[PDB]
């Protein structure tokens, strides 16, 4: 199965309440493995999964130096955008930044990412060809021209297609127990009378990994998408995920409905029916 590595960074200004807040997090597929928080006491990159914990001191020291350096770039960036939009120094602003790489089933480079947002909207993004940029507006065209002259896209491409993929594979191997695990969902249905002639049928999927899953209801084999309540996939807290789907049925028609489950950890898609 395909895999990914991602770094997510958030910077928030606090006019007059000290310097900006900066939070950095890193993930491998849906498992988080490191963090950095500018308000914390350590001032270092920190482990968030057991498998990265025994990387030696040279790894930790290098990641800490790099994440500090990114922090400071975001401190300057908040002032720069403030000038580009001619905003006051009294409002609170947010900068977000992401980068990553996806590899396929053969563990081979498939795609690379790098983009920024300002106050919740797209500002600038590297295109899929890893040579061009998408600028959201007039302010972002100024950044794009700067980055074109300094040949920033070339530098990003060597990281996304090279280094990113090499360390992703190394992580996949070292954390194999956690990261190469496939956990099939534990499923079951509940039935609850809401009235004297209707009932709620709920279809559950628990303790699964990874997060991706398809869970739907059918009536006589026909799609019921507009009458199904589907909750967002969510974390159980122990490294696994959960999800449910429900439909309100007329009493007497329970047998017409089927719950369909699809996931990587299942040998064949599942079909459940209350009966």
């Amino acid at each position: 199965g395909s895999h990914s590595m991602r770094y997510f960074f958030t910077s928030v200004s606090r006019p007059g309440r000290g310097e900006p807040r900066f939070i950095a997090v890193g993930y491998v597929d849906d498992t988080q493995f490191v963090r950095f928080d500018s308000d914390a006491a350590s001032q270092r990159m920190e482990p968030r999964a057991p498998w990265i914990e025994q990387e030696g001191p040279e790894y930790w020291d290098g990641e800490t130096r790099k994440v500090k350096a990114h922090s400071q770039t975001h401190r300057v960036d908040l002032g720069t955008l403030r000038g580009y939009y001619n905003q006051s120094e009294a409002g609170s602003h947010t900068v977000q930044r992401m980068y990553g790489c996806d590899v396929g089933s053969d563990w081979r480079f498939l795609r690379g990412y790098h983009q920024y947002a300002y106050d919740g909207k797209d500002y600038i993004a590297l295109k899929e060809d890893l040579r061009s940029w998408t600028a959201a507006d007039m302010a972002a065209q100024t950044t794009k021209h700067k980055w074109e002259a300094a040949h920033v896209a070339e530098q990003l491409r060597a990281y996304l297609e090279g280094t990113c993929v090499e360390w992703l594979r190394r992580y996949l191997e070292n954390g194999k127990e956690t990261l190469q695990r496939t956990d099939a969902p534990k499923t079951h249905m509940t039935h609850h009378a809401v009235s004297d002639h209707e009932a709620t049928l709920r279809c559950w999927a628990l303790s699964f990994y990874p997060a991706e899953i398809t869970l739907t209801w059918q009536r006589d084999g026909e799609d019921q998408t507009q009458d199904t309540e589907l909750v967002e996939t969510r974390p159980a807290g122990d490294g696994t995920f959960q999800k449910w789907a429900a439909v309100v049925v007329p009493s007497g028609q329970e047998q017409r409905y089927t719950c369909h489950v699809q996931h990587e950890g299942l040998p064949k898609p599942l079909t459940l029916r209350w009966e």
Partner: peptide, 9 residues
């Protein structure tokens, strides 16, 4: 492993 090049907007 995080990138070690830090560009500015």
């Amino acid at each position: 492993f995080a990138p070690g090049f830090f560009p500015y907007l």
